[PDB]
């Protein structure tokens, strides 16, 4: 109910106030700046009321920020712009419109006298309080159809704005050794013949005048492993030493810290130092033998190329008779490349697709369970007709509303927290070859997850647990007529989920505490010995991965429930408001960037957007048409074919400045760069980048 | 009913043995080498009981007949025979199943004893026959996905067949100059440089080392119009001097025969002399003036370069920022491009695009009228309830059985005779630029087309014509019912339609009376003057455009009915096999090709294949849907998703073979041919092509 809501806001505005407090006294402190300010010591320009950052971090231009953070970051903060942009005026139309229109009423009254347990007064602002008429259902498509419009307006000049930004990013970029170079994975094995040769002779000849070196990826993934255990184990041993310089007075160390109550053969300083000789001695003789070996060498090569134009052109064209071999991609960078699954056979890749997507269904559905499970929390209000738990309910009324608003929303961000953490490693499970396409997968797949079990789960199950009542004694014939009113007090429910997870996650994520509770275990417990703890700055990316499906869900909710209940919206603009002022600042001070992809992720957020587009005008269809409705099937049917024919024009007209590279803009980029430096030695600057960093 | 189908069945075969004996008694004529033997005077290779030239048609191997006909022509052959190797297995296992099946039931007779005006036997082989139960379902269903499943498979192995022959095809064929050009359409206009000159620097800057030369393509449609009238009015001169010299007694020759009655001033060879003279001083002046006026010169070009594998490049890769500007495409060859619509700004492109949509439907309509006509025919035999006009029906028992048959079927092949020349000008109107992607695409327009008008239409009005007094009292839940047991009535149609059609039309197109006639009367009544007649040998082409729909459909139709009413196939599979050696000895023979797209349109069948197929599956599903059975829709959702994926995995592995050049081939082309002719001077071959044959 409307108390639930408001009682629910109180307590997230006093939580994200006192996070911002907290965050306020931490940032003054002078031993976090390390922390709090990341992107100025990575990027090398520092060294050593409360809300006053929130202005300061709007001054910094776009132009600027472009060349501060990257291009990703800047179209990033444009997502939660566009955000704004697209839902803005739909808030202020809906609300003005449909508000005056759905309290007009005094029938459902009667309607839900009979057995209905609906909510008062925070359903009267939505579609089901009216019954089947002429002039409102009227009004409602003619709103539709205005908010497609306008969403549909913004998406088309945002996604020229983006294309622009991304050529003219690129024509004017530094000199990356991913320009020169495609990716050759498919090269067929020959018997006479190694990788590399079979490399040198194929782009010799088939590709002449313009090839200028080539790297087969080796597979050193055990000793990339080797590498790490060494690493790790360094740790332990430097830990373990500044124990015992701290109390010198006995080496205990006993290993019982583990499972199984294993732990014996007390483990002080000396075994340390003796597994770390031994890995050394194992580290340097896998090294020795995986140079020294025809097997290591896995069928794929990093070729580069003279000028950015035959790079273009090789990446651009099909290479050869199979369309299974010889596959040549636009090479990522150095610092991009996931190096662990370069040494997956191009058949294990089809393989692994197929096995992730079945464990993203059983993922799928193990958490609608779960799903369940929170929407059978504080939203079980309706089912006190049996009462077998009336205790914790009777308890008290006003903390009854404290928990019917909080506890579901907690419950559920507790609940998928880790959940992008297993999509990235499902993601990573069927091979990418680059932290990039690994995040947008995961993107990807995090939104599928979330579509699905949060909406519809959450949607069917709250219908069934709380309609429960109202169709128990009833038929077959009922069933659909409880599926369409359904739907508004799931949106209550999404409020509360927007609220609590929205504005109090993005407090807690400026508050960074996280990294600084990480930074300052691993600043006193470990190394601690001269200035060369500057790998102990970790911020992170932006975190496309865990941010951008998000909002994709917030995007889905407020145009499904834009026309359907219009007071979802005022919590969405919040929620974007404020997390674009959060963004940027962090964009501005933390969060390192990993990989420059230049914004090639925006087809996809279009993509998601306009999917979005179609799933709301769909419901919409199907709930004024379950509503005993006649001509609204035949208006909102135009609706999901008008979208997808703009979405096709937009995709042909302005992607390839996204997903192809322009001919002439490469023989600019490299006539502009010849005339600058004459001099230029590309075979010495070119030939050591991709060489599985582990090798050195 | 049976009896219908047997009637129909004689008259047909009568039809097919008659016109086969008319066309062996013409071939034997002397007179008539010219005609049918055309492929042979154009290739220069000659001058100058009755089945027996069907076993002889069947000698030339495939390796010969690719260099004899072409490709296209080889390919189309080989759609007949996948027809055959889809169907007649799908055949023998449906009959051997379905009819034992089918045929035994007592049921229907009361079902058919109420009101039911369904015929006696020829439904009793059908899906409408038996009622919902467990054990028959059963075996439709897994027929069906049998058929889907071999149907699946011969399409893969077909596709792959295909795009190796268009691949070994390609890489040892001549040196059209199509190999080395592209067509750059969309030069932007620029105030101080020409077109010629834009095109000149663009394509030396930006794509250098490789750029020969251009043509650019001027607008002389006035000129073409001005030659075509000349060369009619010469023929009318020509025809008319003949007159004169046959008959040297008055030169009465009044034009009074047009429409308005108009015609006086007596026209005779003075009228026409004075014509041409006058027609040859206008062509003259205006070929002055376009070749001396600015805006004659579109913004369009015809670019040509040193090496295939330049040419290559510039047409699979993106020309600049713009991607509606320089936009490049493998051009036609010269004897190939529809030089008229090279003058249509890429605006009006589009905008005549969704003009003829708007006409496609229209069109669709005011033809679904006849369809509605033709269905009001002679399968009008239900409708003997009213009895307003039993005149004709109870003239005899055996002419009706014979109108029964055979007029549905004529009136419908005349009424869509004149069809694909509609679409033709449809097609050509909106513009393409080469008879090749006009053919394809009025074939793709005449699929369409008879897919909703000849298989909807005649469905749902033979439905509403035949059982209209089994629902005309009933109530609005008996419709699906009627819906679900109408198809096989359609079926007994559409056996006598594919007869009728399909081996009557192949018959006479083997016996080639239009192009005969047209031939004796220009070479009687026309110029008989000396050897000049060759060029009156117009065989045309295959007809790729009016014949692949055909078969299309009929593979519809095939698909459709094979699980539902497994006697449609059997006469199927007599026209293919009968219309691939009609059209086999006509690819050898007759039939010369006026362009060379080498199998390009392969990608076009197949996936008209794979939608017939998901067609089939869908009316599968809303049939035993329908007829009040429980398991089946789960099951038959899977096929049309399996369908797709198989498309899709086609797709991805074979169809680059057809729609993009590899590189590596390119290559060994290019090598190939300067290791053999090394002092060939491309740009003395190739700057006069691409001229727009009226310059000469």
Same mark, same amino acid.
Request: glycine letters at 4%; hydrophobic letters at 50%.
């Given at each position: 109910?409307?108390?639930?809501?408001?009682?629910?806001?109180?307590?997230?505005?006093?939580?994200?106030?006192?996070?911002?407090?907290?965050?306020?006294?931490?940032?003054?402190?002078?031993?976090?700046?390390?922390?709090?300010?990341?992107?100025w010591?990575?990027?090398?320009?520092?060294?050593?009321?409360?809300?006053?950052?929130?202005?300061?971090?709007?001054?910094?231009?776009?132009?600027?920020?472009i060349?501060?953070?990257?291009?990703?970051?800047?179209?990033?903060?444009?997502?939660?712009?566009?955000?704004?942009?697209?839902?803005?005026?739909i808030?202020?139309?809906?609300?003005?419109?449909?508000?005056?229109?759905?309290?007009?009423?005094?029938?459902l009254?009667?309607?839900k006298?009979?057995?209905?347990?609906?909510?008062?007064?925070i359903?009267?602002?939505?579609?089901s309080?009216?019954?089947?008429?002429?002039?409102?259902?009227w009004?409602h498509?003619?709103?539709?159809?205005?908010?497609?419009?306008?969403?549909?307006?913004?998406?088309?000049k945002?996604?020229?704005?983006?294309?622009?930004?991304?050529?003219?990013?690129?024509?004017?970029?530094?000199?990356?050794?991913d320009?020169?170079?495609?990716?050759?994975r498919?090269?067929?094995?020959?018997?006479?013949?190694?990788?590399?040769?079979?490399?040198?002779?194929?782009?010799?000849?088939?590709?002449?005048?313009?090839?200028?070196?080539?790297?087969?990826?080796?597979?050193?993934?055990?000793?990339?492993?080797?590498?790490?255990?060494?690493?790790?184990?360094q740790?332990?041993?430097?830990?373990?030493? #500044? %124990?015992?310089?701290?109390?010198?007075?006995?080496?205990?160390? &006993?290993?019982l $810290? !583990? /499972?199984?109550?294993?732990?014996? @053969?007390?483990?002080?300083?000396?075994?340390?130092?003796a597994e770390?000789?031994?890995?050394?001695?194992?580290?340097?003789?896998?090294?020795?033998?995986?140079?020294?070996?025809?097997?290591?060498?896995?069928?794929?090569?990093?070729?580069?190329?003279?000028?950015?134009?035959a790079?273009?052109?090789?990446?651009q064209?099909?290479?050869?008779?199979?369309?299974?071999?010889?596959?040549?991609?636009?090479?990522?960078?150095?610092?991009?490349?996931?190096?662990?699954?370069?040494?997956?056979?191009?058949?294990?890749?089809?393989?692994?697709?197929?096995?992730?997507?079945?464990?993203?269904?059983?993922?799928?559905?193990?958490?609608?369970?779960?799903?369940?499970?929170?929407?059978s929390?504080?939203?079980?209000?309706?089912?006190?007709?049996?009462?077998?738990? #009336? %205790?914790?309910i009777?308890?008290?009324?006003?903390?009854?509303? &404290?928990?019917? $608003? !909080? /506890?579901?929303?907690?419950?559920? @961000?507790?609940?998928?927290?880790?959940?992008?953490?297993?999509?990235?490693?499902?993601?990573?499970?069927?091979?990418?070859?680059?932290?990039?396409?690994?995040?947008?997968?995961?993107?990807?797949?995090?939104?599928?997850?979330?579509?699905?079990?949060?909406?519809?789960?959450?949607?069917?199950?709250?219908?069934?647990?709380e309609?429960?009542?109202?169709?128990?004694?009833?038929?077959?014939?009922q069933?659909?007529?409880?599926?369409?009113?359904?739907?508004?007090?799931?949106?209550?429910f999404?409020?509360?989920?927007?609220?609590?997870?929205?504005?109090?996650?993005?407090?807690?994520?400026?508050?960074m505490?996280?990294?600084?509770?990480?930074?300052?275990?691993?600043?006193?417990?470990?190394?601690?010995?001269?200035?060369?703890?500057?790998?102990?700055?970790?911020?992170?990316?932006?975190?496309?991965?865990?941010?951008?499906?998000?909002?994709?869900?917030?995007?889905?909710?407020?145009?499904?429930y834009?026309?359907?209940?219009?007071?979802?919206?005022?919590?969405?603009?919040?929620?974007?408001?404020?997390?674009?002022?959060?963004?940027?600042?962090?964009?501005?001070?933390?969060?390192?960037?990993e990989?420059?992809?230049?914004?090639?992720?925006?087809?996809?957020?279009?993509?998601?957007?306009?999917?979005?587009?179609?799933?709301?005008?769909?419901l919409?269809?199907?709930?004024?048409?379950?509503?005993?409705?006649?001509?609204?099937?035949?208006?909102?049917?135009?609706?999901?074919?008008?979208?997808?024919?703009?979405?096709?024009?937009?995709?042909?007209?302005?992607?390839?400045?996204?997903?192809?590279?322009?001919?002439?803009?490469?023989?600019?980029?490299?006539?502009?760069?010849?005339?600058?430096?004459?001099?230029?030695?590309?075979?010495?600057?070119?030939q050591?980048?991709?060489?599985?960093?582990?090798?050195?």
């Amino acid at each position: 109910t409307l108390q639930d809501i408001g009682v629910s806001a109180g307590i997230n505005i006093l939580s994200a106030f006192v996070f911002f407090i907290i965050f306020a006294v931490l940032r003054l402190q002078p031993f976090n700046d390390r922390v709090y300010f990341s992107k100025w010591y990575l990027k090398g320009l520092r060294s050593s009321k409360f809300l006053n950052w929130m202005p300061e971090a709007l001054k910094m231009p776009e132009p600027e920020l472009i060349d501060h953070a990257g291009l990703d970051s800047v179209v990033y903060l444009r997502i939660y712009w566009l955000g704004l942009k697209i839902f803005t005026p739909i808030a202020v139309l809906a609300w003005a419109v449909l508000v005056p229109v759905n309290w007009t009423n005094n029938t459902l009254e009667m309607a839900k006298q009979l057995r209905n347990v609906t909510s008062s007064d925070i359903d009267k602002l939505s579609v089901s309080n009216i019954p089947e008429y002429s002039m409102r259902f009227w009004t409602h498509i003619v709103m539709a159809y205005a908010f497609t419009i306008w969403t549909c307006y913004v998406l088309m000049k945002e996604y020229e704005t983006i294309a622009n930004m991304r050529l003219q990013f690129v024509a004017s970029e530094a000199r990356r050794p991913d320009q020169f170079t495609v990716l050759v994975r498919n090269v067929p094995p020959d018997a006479d013949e190694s990788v590399s040769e079979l490399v040198e002779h194929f782009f010799l000849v088939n590709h002449p005048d313009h090839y200028l070196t080539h790297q087969v990826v080796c597979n050193a993934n055990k000793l990339a492993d080797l590498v790490k255990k060494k690493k790790k184990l360094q740790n332990w041993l430097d830990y373990y030493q #500044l %124990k015992y310089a701290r109390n010198n007075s006995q080496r205990i160390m &006993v290993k019982l $810290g !583990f /499972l199984g109550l294993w732990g014996q @053969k007390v483990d002080a300083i000396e075994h340390y130092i003796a597994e770390i000789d031994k890995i050394s001695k194992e580290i340097s003789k896998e090294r020795e033998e995986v140079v020294n070996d025809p097997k290591a060498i896995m069928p794929a090569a990093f070729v580069s190329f003279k000028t950015r134009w035959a790079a273009a052109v090789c990446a651009q064209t099909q290479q050869t008779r199979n369309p299974t071999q010889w596959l040549t991609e636009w090479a990522p960078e150095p610092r991009d490349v996931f190096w662990s699954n370069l040494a997956i056979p191009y058949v294990s890749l089809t393989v692994r697709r197929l096995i992730m997507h079945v464990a993203f269904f059983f993922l799928t559905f193990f958490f609608i369970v779960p799903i369940a499970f929170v929407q059978s929390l504080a939203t079980i209000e309706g089912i006190v007709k049996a009462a077998p738990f #009336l %205790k914790f309910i009777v308890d008290d009324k006003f903390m009854k509303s &404290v928990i019917q $608003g !909080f /506890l579901p929303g907690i419950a559920l @961000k507790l609940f998928l927290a880790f959940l992008p953490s297993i999509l990235m490693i499902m993601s990573k499970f069927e091979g990418f070859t680059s932290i990039s396409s690994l995040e947008r997968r995961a993107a990807f797949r995090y939104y599928i997850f979330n579509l699905v079990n949060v909406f519809l789960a959450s949607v069917i199950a709250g219908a069934a647990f709380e309609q429960l009542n109202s169709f128990l004694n009833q038929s077959a014939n009922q069933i659909p007529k409880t599926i369409g009113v359904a739907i508004p007090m799931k949106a209550t429910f999404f409020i509360t989920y927007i609220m609590v997870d929205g504005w109090a996650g993005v407090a807690g994520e400026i508050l960074m505490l996280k990294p600084l509770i990480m930074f300052h275990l691993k600043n006193a417990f470990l190394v601690k010995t001269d200035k060369d703890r500057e790998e102990a700055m970790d911020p992170g990316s932006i975190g496309f991965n865990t941010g951008e499906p998000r909002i994709q869900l917030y995007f889905l909710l407020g145009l499904v429930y834009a026309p359907v209940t219009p007071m979802l919206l005022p919590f969405i603009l919040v929620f974007f408001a404020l997390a674009y002022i959060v963004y940027r600042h962090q964009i501005i001070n933390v969060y390192n960037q990993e990989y420059e992809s230049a914004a090639a992720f925006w087809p996809d957020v279009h993509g998601r957007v306009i999917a979005a587009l179609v799933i709301s005008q769909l419901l919409l269809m199907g709930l004024l048409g379950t509503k005993h409705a006649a001509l609204a099937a035949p208006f909102l049917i135009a609706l999901p074919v008008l979208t997808i024919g703009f979405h096709h024009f937009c995709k042909g007209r302005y992607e390839p400045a996204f997903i192809r590279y322009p001919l002439q803009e490469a023989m600019m980029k490299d006539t502009l760069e010849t005339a600058r430096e004459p001099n230029l030695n590309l075979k010495g600057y070119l030939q050591n980048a991709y060489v599985h960093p582990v090798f050195k």
